[PDB]
Design a protein around this nucleic acid. Structure first.
Ligand code: MG
Ligand code: MG
Ligand code: MG
Ligand code: MG
Ligand code: MG
Ligand code: MG
Ligand code: MG
Ligand code: ZN
Lengths: 196, 51, 67, 56
RNA sequence: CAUGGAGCCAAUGAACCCGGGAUUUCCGAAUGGGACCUCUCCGUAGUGAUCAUUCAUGAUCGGGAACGCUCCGAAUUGAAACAUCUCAGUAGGAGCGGGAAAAGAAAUCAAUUGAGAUGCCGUAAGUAACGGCGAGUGAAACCGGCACAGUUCAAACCGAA
């Protein structure tokens, strides 16, 4: 088993409760809770995950940690007449996942980049921290980079807000094909939102 | 003596000079087909939408 | 014919262009000053042609990089 | 004193001034927002789908 | 627009139309500070906010008839009442965005053996399915077409090449 060290990082992060990642988790969440909603970091907390998701060690790529509240879409009780099925909102969690929420907040704070992907990095009772990869589509290195130069196209600006990232496509019910995607692909809006 | 700034008095000046009849030669040139415009008004009526 | 053609403005110099602009502004001041009494100009096309001439001279000056 | 013509002579003041961005007399003087174009509240122009009818 | 008086422009080729420039006050994304003041104060002359970077420079901001994508989301009404249902993911809202956008190259659909990305059109079909199994809602595959397109990363091995 001549395995790269990225494999060892992935092994350490496969079951993080029963590895050395638990000690680092207890030491790291103290610093992470104090930080802001969208915090920039030097290196990704899990380098193998970022590299498989598309991170490269070059300028014009930014990695940011985002804190998102745990739980579903907290909603307001309606103050006007509802038919008793559209009146209850405590047991309603929306169609926006927390990963999409974190990606959209990272895209909001960093307007001149694009959200590439993101991955779970840690969590506690009240928060979920996600590390979001962003790309600079106007840096010359990304312009020259042929494996990232698709992002310079006009159709790629606003990926995380048009549901084009991997968490976005998962949330739009496009992880699979065949049966079950009769009302999701090619878009939720195409079938009057009946899928999802 | 309402106390206007410069722009308010400029708007009232334009409103004042809009409130004049069509010239006689315009009526003569147009074969009397242009005899008025909508901006005629009197000060003791509907107030200006100026200030 | 015209007050002064733009080719003649290109023929002129910087000092002569400034002198022509000064004289044209002074004559436009005189023509607009007489109309403050309301009396029509003896040359009613003169005012518009002098303004167009001033525009043409300013265009030539900006083309020649004077200001 | 009445609610009709008696108390309508107190209309010697304003609540809407002529907005800069659109030249309409809709700029509220207390909320600092034009209720026609939304200047003072947003960079974009306020336009809603209920300002016209459903196109079908 | 709109062949009135008096002049002016035009054979140094105007007017007019196409193309390329100049000028383009103040506000407005409005962006040096400020707005019941479309102006005003400081002038040390203005890159306001959020960002990328080699800190040279660069990006986003607003608008656009509808369309596109993402998320949030009623009630009238129908059931001859009405609550599941329907109205309807409609109306409306928030974000993003281009000339198109989304989709997209199987951890697929089939059936005993096959096909070979996606979209859209016809049909399957008011069928399967759902449903106070009430009222109603309601596909896809196969198939016939429009059009045809396949690939790039992570990793193994090398190690600044
Ligand atoms: Mg925030
Ligand atoms: Mg596309
Ligand atoms: Mg509509
Ligand atoms: Mg009924
Ligand atoms: Mg925009
Ligand atoms: Mg795809
Ligand atoms: Mg339905
Ligand atoms: Zn306004």
């Amino acid at each position: 088993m001549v395995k790269s060290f990225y494999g060892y990082v992935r092994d350490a992060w496969k079951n993080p409760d029963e590895t050395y990642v638990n000690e680092l988790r207890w030491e790291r969440l103290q610093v992470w809770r104090k930080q802001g909603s969208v915090t920039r970091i030097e290196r990704p907390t899990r380098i193998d995950r970022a590299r498989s998701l598309g991170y490269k060690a070059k300028q014009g790529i930014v990695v940011v940690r985002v804190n998102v509240r745990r739980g579903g879409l907290g909603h307001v009780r309606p103050n006007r007449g509802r038919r008793t099925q559209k009146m209850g909102k405590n047991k309603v969690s929306g169609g926006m996942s927390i990963q999409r929420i974190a990606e959209v907040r990272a895209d909001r704070r960093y307007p001149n980049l694009e959200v590439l992907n993101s991955y779970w990095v840690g969590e506690d009772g009240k928060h979920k921290w996600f590390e979001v990869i962003l790309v600079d589509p106007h840096h010359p290195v990304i312009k020259s980079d042929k494996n990232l130069n698709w992002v310079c196209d006009p159709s790629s600006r606003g990926r995380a807000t048009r549901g084009k990232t991997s968490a976005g496509r998962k949330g739009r019910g496009m992880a699979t094909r065949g049966k079950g995607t009769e009302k999701t692909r090619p878009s939720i809006r195409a079938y009057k939102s009946r899928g999802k | 003596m309402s106390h206007n700034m410069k722009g308010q008095k400029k708007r009232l000046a334009k409103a004042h000079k809009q409130n004049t009849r069509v010239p006689v030669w315009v009526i003569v040139k147009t074969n009397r087909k242009v005899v008025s415009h909508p901006r005629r008004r009197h000060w003791r009526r509907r107030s200006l939408d100026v200030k | 014919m015209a007050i002064l053609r733009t080719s003649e403005i290109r023929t002129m110099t910087i000092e002569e262009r400034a002198d022509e602009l000064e004289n044209l502004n002074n004559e436009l001041v005189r023509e607009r000053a007489l109309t403050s009494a309301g009396g029509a100009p003896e040359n009613p096309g003169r005012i518009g042609e002098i303004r167009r001439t001033i525009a043409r001279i300013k265009t030539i000056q900006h083309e020649l990089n004077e200001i | 004193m009445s609610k009709g013509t008696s108390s309508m002579g107190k209309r010697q003041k304003r609540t809407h001034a002529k907005c800069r961005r659109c030249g309409s007399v809709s700029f509220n003087v207390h909320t600092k927002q034009c209720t026609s174009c939304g200047f003072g509240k947003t960079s974009r122009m306020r336009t809603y789908k209920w300002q016209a009818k459903c196109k079908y």
